[PDB]
């Protein structure tokens, strides 16, 4: 049943290799024992392999169950860095393809809500340049991953929100507290809030980026999660 399916994954038959690929994006979709029977099947290590194909559509599906796995536990995301996801992952964030660009950067995303062992692997991958590059992406579902990555690796610690800023990501996420989608706000202020929690040089940086005015706006936002946000944010600049 899934023993068929990972040796399908070492084929030279596009079609049942591509078939195979979507077949157990559809399982790691299922939950965390759906990925943990995954990763005892030994699915990881030939998935990784699969990033880096002649195929661009065999990629596309390869990704997209990486970023599934990637939705796992602590544990999980262990064992698909462990499995050396996270450099080729890190590759795909410079490619033509944006179907490819949108589950890098969601695999990235969810790798990144782990612990800060796991920011610091990310961050040593090279994640935060080419994600706040992303920021300037012009498709909206780019923008959003990559926006809810900078906002997970901002839940780190002081160092890693430092990483941060010295990539580049203030002025790129208080431009997207407005004029952006309602997704993309809601995960501008989340990034923002988590930046604000980090030390009073970073809370003075946000400052400078123009932040606070920014806020005041979402201060009185009739969504619970951007409202929260904001005046938390807003509490650490005054």
Same mark, same amino acid.
């Given at each position: ?7 399908? +994954?070492?084929? /030279? ?24 029977? +995954? ?6 290590? /030939? ?5 880096? =194909? ?40 410079? =490619? ?39 920021? =300037? =992406? ?31 990501? +203030?002025? /790129?996420?208080?431009?997207? +507290? ?61």
């Amino acid at each position: 049943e899934l023993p068929q399916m990972v040796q399908q +994954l070492n084929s /030279p038959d596009q079609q049942e290799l591509q078939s195979a690929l979507r077949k157990l994006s559809q399982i790691a979709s299922g939950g965390n024992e759906q990925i943990q029977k +995954l990763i005892e099947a030994g699915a990881l290590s /030939p998935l990784v392999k699969l990033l880096d =194909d002649a195929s661009e559509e065999v990629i596309k599906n390869a990704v997209a169950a990486i970023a599934n796995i990637a939705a796992g536990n602590n544990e999980q995301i262990q064992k698909l860095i462990e499995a050396g996801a996270l450099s080729p992952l890190v590759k795909l964030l410079d =490619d033509a393809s944006e179907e490819v660009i949108k589950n890098a950067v969601a695999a990235i995303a969810n790798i990144a809500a782990g612990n800060n062992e796991q920011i610091q692997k990310l961050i040593e991958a090279g994640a935060l340049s080419p994600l706040v590059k992303l920021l =300037d =992406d012009a498709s909206e579902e780019v923008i959003k991953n990559a926006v809810a990555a900078i906002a997970n690796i901002a839940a780190g610690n002081n160092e890693q929100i430092q990483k941060l800023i010295e990539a580049g990501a +203030l002025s /790129p996420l208080v431009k997207l +507290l407005d004029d952006a989608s309602e997704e993309v706000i809601k995960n501008a202020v989340a990034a923002i809030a988590n930046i604000a929690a980090g030390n009073n040089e970073q809370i003075q940086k946000l400052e400078e980026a123009g932040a606070e005015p920014a806020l005041e706006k979402l201060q009185s936002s009739p969504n619970e999660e951007v409202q929260k946000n904001a005046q938390a944010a807003l509490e650490a600049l005054n």
